[PDB]
Amino acid sequence: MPIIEQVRAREILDSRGNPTVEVEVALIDGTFARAAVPSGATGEHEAVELRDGGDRYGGKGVQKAVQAVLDEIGPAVIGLNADDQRLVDQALVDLDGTPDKSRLGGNAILGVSLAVAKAAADSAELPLFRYVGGPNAHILPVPMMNILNGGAHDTAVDIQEFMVAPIGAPSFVEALRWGAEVYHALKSVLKKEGLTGLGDEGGFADVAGTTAALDLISRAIESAGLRPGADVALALDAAATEFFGTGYVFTRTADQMTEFYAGLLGAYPLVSIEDPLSEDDWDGWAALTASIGDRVQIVGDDIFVTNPERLEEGIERGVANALLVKVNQIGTLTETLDAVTLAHHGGYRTMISHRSGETEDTMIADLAVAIGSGQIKTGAPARSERVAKYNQLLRIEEALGDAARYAGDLAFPRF
Ligand SMILES: [Mg+2]
């Protein structure tokens, strides 16, 4: 059966080197799955990691979340069937007791949520992406690679994340190759120039501004042998609630900023702009929607905080046209898939994302295909807690045989 027998937890370290929560579920059929949770630390609206505090691991201890698993979650889940993800995830949700998943920790609750679905697919003999996404799920996603980290990670280049997106590629296999080829070209470009140590997501680091970034990457694309736009597009997370009394800096206002964007949108082949105009600045979103609505994809990172209540409002109130999907924000798979399915009933595009503190876990690879997002943001072809998702996506495409199809240009309609 898909009947949960054991649920044990471990304290392990993420890509930053900071404790997180590893959950090991045993199904009665014999299945034993691993799953790891990534902090990547924010907001009140996001779920609340149960961290230790104290001087152990600089307050970043996860012992309580672990003990929380073995003491309470484990016995609460043990004996149920993994194959009722909605029922397990609700059961986990209640047992906690709060809005913020504060009491049992969202790090511990997702960890249980995910180690279930892993076992619930190795039960059924379904690769994770098939099982969770059924069998029509065959869309290998455009890799949105964050080659250059920026302001908020020097606030000199105010943009946070500068992304290569190989929409032109005939396959995911090729799309991976381009990205790596071009990341390695930009290594070359910046090596020759004074500008090459790595950032938290494998992204490279002073800089003149937004234009310098673009100017740099355009050249890297050309240097790699690819044409910008047709082969490799470009995209960014501004994280504009880092620029911010009225707080735009890049000095600009929301409507004034929409023009800054409009400028970039004309010359540089932008496929998607992430978290422009703050998180709570609803007015800015409607103006940005009005201004660049159908020339660029506009995606909500911190605005929507992967929470359906806020995205509903944004969709109803017409903020953005696509959502960034962070599983650890929301805390459960079922709640996460609801996020996807709400947005897909509504028709916002999906972009499954990582966090800055990642693990060797590659579930986001499978998850992204299963939801057929057509887009995955999982970092530069560099740190292996980035690359392992990419390799995983190799294998899935391998697995899919002729069934596979690479989102590519139909990932982003506007170009
Ligand atoms: Mg961001």
Author numbering: 1 to 41, 43 to 154, 156 to 197, 199 to 208, 210 to 248, 251 to 256, 260 to 424
Sentences from the study reporting this entry:
Enolase, a ubiquitous enzyme, catalyzes the reversible conversion of 2-phospho­glycerate (2PG) to phospho­enolpyruvate (PEP) in the glycolytic pathway of organisms of all three domains of life. Here we present structural snapshots of Mycobacterium tuberculosis (Mtb) enolase in apo, PEP-bound and two 2PG-bound forms as it catalyzes the conversion of PEP to 2PG. MtEno has a topology similar to other enolase structures, a smaller N-terminal domain and a larger C-terminal domain. The crystal and the cryoEM structures (enzyme in solution, frozen) along with the biochemical studies clearly demonstrate that the functional unit of MtEno is an octamer.
The octameric fraction was further used for structural studies. The structure of enolase in the apo state was determined using both cryoEM and X-ray crystallography. One of them, described here as IF1, is similar to the interface observed in conventional dimers, whereas the other, IF2, exists in between two neighboring dimers and has only been reported in bacterial enolases. Further, the MtEno crystal structure was superposed with its Synechococcus elongates counterpart with which it showed a low RMSD of 0.65 Å. The protein overall fold is highly conserved, except for a small conformational variation in loop 1 [Fig. S4(a)]. Notably, the pK a of Lys335 is estimated to be ∼11.5 in the MtEno WT apo state, unable to facilitate a reduction reaction on the carbanion intermediate.
